[PDB]
């Protein structure tokens, strides 16, 4: 007979007893087992081809993508503990700011600034939701996939906060057309038209290393600095205490996505030529992120200073990774 093991056979010999994280997240994708024929069917279906083209054949290379570990070590159980806690905090804020009548106290120029700069963001957030959900279904290791996992449910979290506040805001200001106009603002407004082309175009980069870089490394920071950091700085000096707080609460999600991106980038630099592969993709996409961030921040109060801080905080993200 084969003898009973202390852990799984793929974790045997670690010096150290595997964690719940490793126990439930590692070495779980099985399409990577037969690269010449991912799925147990004919080797020429479109999805066999999609997966060989965009997963296996990606210029970003490593011998062992299953060695990756999410530095926050999230599993589903932990993720709901953390986010039920964060949402008690954010729903408490909605509850109690409403009780006070916070929305009734905002100036009319602010109300108008929300309608144009704040609530159409439901579209930009659903889009990074899709973007990160694509990364999940093409990444080469289940521990990578899991990070896009929890990140996607965060993007849906921000969509959600927005749907809700946008309704609260139409209740207070039935004539602004909150709820009715975001699609147009998103479709037609110049302040939106650099983000929109950054993400419509990034949403068709199918190479898992290219989707990664463009969603995580370049689009999400330009979106986070424009929409969380600078619209919520602006909210806060403008009297909108709720958005100010909201945005900093969602930035907590964004910093976590960055901790895992930064770790993946670390693991990529182990292999020669990966940096160059990644620097080339950043340089493809960065110009569209500079467009985004100029169209947006320029239309905001204090314009050029918003542009300049967003551009360099966003770029300091990637700086910090090599």
């Amino acid at each position: 007979a084969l003898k009973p093991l202390k852990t799984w056979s793929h974790l045997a010999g670690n010096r150290r007893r595997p964690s719940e994280y490793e126990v439930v997240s590692t070495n779980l994708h099985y399409f990577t087992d037969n690269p010449e024929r991912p799925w147990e069917l004919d080797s020429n279906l479109p999805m066999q081809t999609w997966y060989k083209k965009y997963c296996f054949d990606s210029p970003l290379k490593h011998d062992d993508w299953n060695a990756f570990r999410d530095p926050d070590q999230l599993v589903y159980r932990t993720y709901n503990l953390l986010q039920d806690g964060q949402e008690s905090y954010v729903q408490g804020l909605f509850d109690q700011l409403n009780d006070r009548g916070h929305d009734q106290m905002l100036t009319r120029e602010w109300v108008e600034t929300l309608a144009r700069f704040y609530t159409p963001a439901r579209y930009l957030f659903h889009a990074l939701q899709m973007g990160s959900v694509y990364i999940h279904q093409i990444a080469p290791a289940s521990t990578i996939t899991n990070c896009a996992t929890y990140e996607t449910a965060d993007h849906l979290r921000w969509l959600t906060h927005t749907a809700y506040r946008t309704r609260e805001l139409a209740n207070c200001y039935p004539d602004v057309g909150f709820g009715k106009r975001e699609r147009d603002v998103w479709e037609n407004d110049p302040a939106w038209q650099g983000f929109r082309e950054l993400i419509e175009k990034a949403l068709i980069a199918w190479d898992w290393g290219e989707a990664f870089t463009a969603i995580n490394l370049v689009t999400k920071p330009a979106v986070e600095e424009a929409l969380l950091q600078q619209l919520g700085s602006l909210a806060q000096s403008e009297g909108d205490t709720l958005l100010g707080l909201l945005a900093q609460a969602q930035k907590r999600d964004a910093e976590r996505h960055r901790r895992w991106s930064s770790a993946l980038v670390k693991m990529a630099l182990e292999k020669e030529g990966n940096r160059e592969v990644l620097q080339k993709w950043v340089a493809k996409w960065e110009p569209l992120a500079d467009k985004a961030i100029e169209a947006y921040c320029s239309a905001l109060p204090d314009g050029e200073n918003a542009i300049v801080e967003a551009k360099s905080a966003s770029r300091y993200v990637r700086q910090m990774m090599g």
């Binding site: 003898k3 126990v23 439930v24 070495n27 039920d84 996939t145």
Partner: protein, 491 residues
């Protein structure tokens, strides 16, 4: 104060826009999205009937795990597992090996829908679906891991799907076709409607009665937790069908419905039936595998299907008939070929088991009972050796299962062969063959285990060679659950 859900919930799935810097076909390619010439506007007409929003999800689901992990930590040092019936130990080893990575894989099939659906309501419900399946695979690895020092076979909760053991190939074969290689809408249908709504939702309720009846409260709490999540996601296929029936596409919707139920049925007749009729100790049966099918699965299909504007599959009557046989097939296949699976199949043919079997299925002893007559006489006669095999069974080219059917006095075993581009294919049913023929580009150059064998790929090319090919070694390869203890009733 807080808003009422009903008041703001649409704005959460008001997320479609008209693309500009890329084209629609570029944003949603048809091989991923599968929108079928139906418009973004027509698809927005899609309406999940169970709403759920982010913060509800996380608080509700935090407390589903609080409970389940709590129940498990509480009974851990009691070790029920070491005292359980061995057809029950084996039901759980089969469960975890066959479903735990397939649960995880389904988050990608969920993600497929999440990215690529043109129904903004599917994209968000598929994002909670994606979550659920993440949980399901994670928990159903965490639970068995508790048992790893008891037996190498519990390592197969992880390892199964990384193997070319035949049952594993049969599972990947199902999942890859239903949910890993289909366009957004095909998957909503094939997977969430056909399989999850149509089979696993009830299977899992039953599965959970049986845990609890067997004294296994950890596994009862486990399975019935995961089952309370199936609705929020299994619902996704319903509304896609309605939109395809209402635009020019009833036939296509029909055709995937037919495909996916046959295939679900076939997986089901090997994975569930064998368990209900032979491993569940006799006095703990309710109803037969067939009674369960007619009361809880089949009625519902006709119900769903009718309200949808769809028809019963062309195969329905035959299907009806096969609830008398197919699993008796897959049972005898498995026990006979026990060293080739990762658990210990339970024969289920004591005298008392046999009169149970006779009143559930009249004819049994006349047909099934025969081979079991022979095999029984052999171990009574110290010839155990003729109760293990010497060749491989013929494997279906569709479900990747043994071709099998009524034996003894009403012998009806048939092979539904098809020659296609210079290759002979073998099919266990008219339906298995029709799944192939309606789409042979999907299946053509796949090779089943027997095929591989015949082609040179399994080396040394003998039984031991095949055991090794399949990653099976003594200590995992399967034997008689109750260790031929039941042979004694015959001497």
């Amino acid at each position: 104060s807080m808003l009422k859900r009903e008041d703001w919930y649409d704005l959460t799935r008001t997320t479609n826009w008209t693309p500009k810097y890329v084209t629609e076909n570029e944003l949603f390619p048809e091989e991923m999205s599968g929108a079928r010439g139906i418009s973004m506007e027509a698809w927005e007409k899609y309406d999940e009937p169970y709403k759920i929003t982010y913060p509800e999800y996380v608080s509700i689901q935090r407390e589903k795990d609080s409970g389940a992990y709590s129940i498990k930590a509480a009974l851990e040092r009691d070790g029920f597992v070491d005292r359980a019936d061995p057809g029950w130990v084996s039901t759980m080893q089969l469960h975890f090996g066959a479903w735990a990575l397939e649960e995880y894989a389904a988050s990608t099939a969920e993600a497929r829908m999440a990215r690529f659906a043109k129904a903004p309501g599917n994209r968000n419900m598929a994002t909670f679906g994606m979550m659920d399946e993440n949980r399901h695979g994670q928990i159903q690895l965490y639970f068995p891991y508790a048992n790893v020092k008891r037996s190498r076979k519990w390592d197969w909760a992880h390892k199964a799907i990384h193997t070319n053991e035949w049952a594993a190939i049969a599972a990947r074969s199902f999942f890859d076709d239903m949910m890993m290689t289909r366009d957004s809408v095909a998957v909503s249908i094939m997977l969430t409607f056909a399989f999850e709504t149509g089979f696993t939702n009830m299977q899992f309720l039953g599965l959970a009665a049986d845990a609890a009846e067997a004294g296994d409260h950890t596994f009862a709490s486990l399975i019935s937790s995961i089952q309370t999540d199936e609705s929020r996601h299994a619902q996704q296929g319903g509304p896609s069908l309605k939109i395809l029936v209402e635009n020019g596409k009833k036939d296509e919707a029909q055709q995937m419905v037919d495909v996916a139920i046959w295939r679900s049925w076939k997986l089901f007749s090997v994975l569930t039936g064998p368990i209900m009729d032979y491993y569940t100790p006799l006095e703990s049966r309710n109803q037969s595998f067939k009674e369960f099918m007619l009361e809880w699965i089949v009625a519902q299909f006709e119900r769903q299907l009718l309200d949808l504007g769809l028809d019963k599959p062309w195969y329905w009557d035959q299907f009806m008939q096969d609830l008398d046989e197919t699993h008796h097939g897959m049972h005898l296949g498995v026990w006979y070929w026990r060293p080739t699976v990762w658990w210990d199949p339970a024969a289920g043919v004591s005298p008392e088991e046999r009169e149970w079997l006779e009143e559930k299925y009249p004819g049994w002893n006349d047909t099934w009972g025969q081979c079991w007559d022979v095999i029984t006489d052999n171990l009574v006669n110290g010839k155990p050796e003729l109760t293990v095999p010497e060749t491989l069974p013929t494997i279906c080219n569709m479900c990747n299962l043994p071709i099998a059917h009524t034996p003894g006095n009403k012998w009806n075993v048939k092979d539904y062969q098809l020659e296609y581009e210079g290759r002979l294919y073998h099919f266990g049913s008219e339906a298995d063959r029709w799944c192939f023929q309606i789409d042979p580009e999907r299946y053509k150059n796949h090779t089943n285990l027997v095929d591989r064998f015949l082609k040179g790929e399994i080396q040394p090319a003998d039984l031991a060679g095949a055991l090794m090919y399949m990653s099976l070694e003594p200590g995992v390869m399967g034997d008689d659950a109750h260790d031929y203890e039941w042979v004694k009733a015959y001497q």
